[PDB]
Amino acid sequence: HMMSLNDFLSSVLPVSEQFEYLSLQSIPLETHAVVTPNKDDKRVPKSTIKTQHFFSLFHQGKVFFSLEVYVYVTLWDEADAERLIFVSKADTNGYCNTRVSVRDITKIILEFILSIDPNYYLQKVKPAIRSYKKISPELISAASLYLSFTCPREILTKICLFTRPASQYLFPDSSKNSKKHILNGEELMKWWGFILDRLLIECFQNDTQAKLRIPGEDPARVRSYLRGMKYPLWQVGDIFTSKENSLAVYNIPLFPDDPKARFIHQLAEEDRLLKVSLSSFWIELQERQEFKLSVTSSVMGISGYSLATPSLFPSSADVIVPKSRKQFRAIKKYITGEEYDTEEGAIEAFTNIRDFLLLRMATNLQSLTGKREH
């Protein structure tokens, strides 16, 4: 019954109220392995395909919500494959005048991503190394590829996120808006906890790994929080392997803009990736992120199989895929490059996105009427 991104969103938005959304997507591309291969490994992923999804929700001619998600599909062979959803950034600007559930909106967008057939990303992949021939300008006289793969539809699915509080993620200076509710680190952890817990109950099989760690904290308080979860199998810790010595570098996934990756790079700069085990990693991560602006960070991981086989190829109503990386960045930058100290930023972002889509792509933002009763 729920099929399109329109169906999903509509279902969590309030009865009879008008919204619009942007669903933007980069062109899938070959990338480095999510986790640094080691020389003892039997598998090197023959290929890792990365795709960014960027979402914005609008009400009454103003942007008010945005969400940045990456989907990696890792290929080992014809027969085995893994998908990973990395939730990078979510944000609010406080420029919405009706009551909505921002967590049910985030949950349901994630539920849309989970329903996508991983083969959708594999049909046309921009290669990591591209062949090229250049014509030197001497030849003009005065008289004058994409890769494709397949995997099974039902594959191991993982979700990784890292909670850390900030004034803003996607809306510069939105903290200057007095209507903006800025979550502290504890609220933020519990807000993402609720979402993933619902995702488990609604979309995952009962044999799914669900993990939480609050780095640099003793695991005693984590276990307390988790007792209030409705999915029965939450455990303290993470979904990461323990290859090599439990060296962190061979186990830690390297995501865009992510604190785990930023510290891995820091360690690389000191020649210490052969010396920092996982247990130390979390300790030393804590101390630098903490001592920078002391604050609760959490790391959450899901790993298991969907209750329903993903088989959707998003239509043009579900996603807009710009022809270029520059066009992708230009559209996104109308949202992220704007100032949100006044409601005018939320208006200009709407105005600019709408005009760009109409003039350069003859496409409108999608409109929805909410269906959820009070």
UniProtKB/Swiss-Prot annotation:
Changing R262E: Decreases activity stimulation by ASF1. Changing K260 to E/W: Increases sensitivity to methyl methane sulfonate, camptothecin and hydroxyurea (genotoxic stress). Changing E348R: Decreases activity stimulation by VPS75. Changing W191A: Decreases histone acetylase activity. Acetyl-CoA binds at A90, D91, T92, R99, V100, S101, V102, R103, F162, A166, H181, I182, L183, W191. It is found in: Nucleus. Optimum pH is >8.5. It is an enzyme of class 2 (transferase). One of its GO terms (cellular component) is chromatin. Induction: Expression peaks in cell cycle G1. GO terms for biological process: cellular response to stress; DNA damage response; maintenance of rDNA; nucleosome assembly; protein modification process; regulation of double-strand break repair via nonhomologous end joining; regulation of gene expression; regulation of transcription by RNA polymerase II. Present with 1140 molecules/cell in log phase SD medium. Histone chaperone-dependent acetylase that modifies 'Lys-9', 'Lys-14', 'Lys-23', 'Lys-27', and 'Lys-56' on histone H3 (H3K9Ac, H3K14Ac and H3K23Ac, H3K27Ac, and H3K56Ac) to promote nucleosome assembly, genomic stability, DNA repair and transcriptional regulation during mitotic S-phase. Its residue selectivity is influenced by the acetylation status of histone H3, and also the presence of histone chaperone ASF1 that shifts selectivity to 'Lys-56' when H3K14Ac is already present. This is Histone acetyltransferase RTT109. It comes from Saccharomyces cerevisiae (strain ATCC 204508 / S288c) (Baker's yeast). The lineage of its organism: Eukaryota, Fungi, Dikarya, Ascomycota, Saccharomycotina.
